């Protein structure tokens, strides 16, 4: 799912937390990818 | 393993385990037990 | 004074163990520096 | 854990190796993230 809250309200600690592990890995890329995006923007800005 | 008596589970008896030398690999080669689940621990590293 | 892979006193590691001047309180014998590495062990 | 050595000294090949798989994935980001960090430093340096 895209929502952990429904997991929590219907599943158990172990499976919910492994699903959250893969969920949280996905968001930890998506963030640091975004940060990489932004600081290559910011490099082009700093040159300009 | 030669236990004389065990208290019932509803008030399962608890014992202290420490300050001795045990070869737990003997059990793996003992095969005298219905189940020998070593979870969170491998049986074949613990005698040493 | 010779680096080896060792299983020390039930505490396993690899490296060299040579006389230590560092202070380890009586309540210590081995303590974890960075990387869970010992500095002196029983030292 | 943060240490695979204790795993090896107490666990079995399959579970130890899956835990190492997730451990090694974490370090493979942390490295290539560091490399990305460094070569955006180095780009700012090369401009300067
Ligand atoms: C593990 C083990 O040896 N358990 C003992 C067995 O050796 C003995 O023969 C039997 C008879 O008292 O009682 C039990
Ligand atoms: C200071 C002291 O009493 N040390 C003892 C000795 O058997 C050994 O040097 C050490 C190594 O683990 O184990 C303990």
Coordinates of C-alpha atoms in Angstrom, one line a residue, chain B residues 38-43 45-46, chain D residues 6-12 15:
Chain B
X38 CA 17.6 -22.5 17.8
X39 CA 16.1 -19.2 16.7
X40 CA 18.2 -16.0 16.9
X41 CA 21.1 -18.4 17.4
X42 CA 22.8 -21.1 15.3
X43 CA 23.2 -24.3 17.3
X45 CA 28.6 -22.4 17.0
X46 CA 27.7 -22.3 20.7
Chain D
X6 CA 28.3 -11.4 15.7
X7 CA 25.7 -12.6 13.2
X8 CA 28.3 -15.0 11.7
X9 CA 29.4 -16.3 15.1
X10 CA 25.6 -16.9 16.0
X11 CA 23.6 -17.3 13.1
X12 CA 23.1 -19.6 9.9
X15 CA 19.3 -15.5 7.6

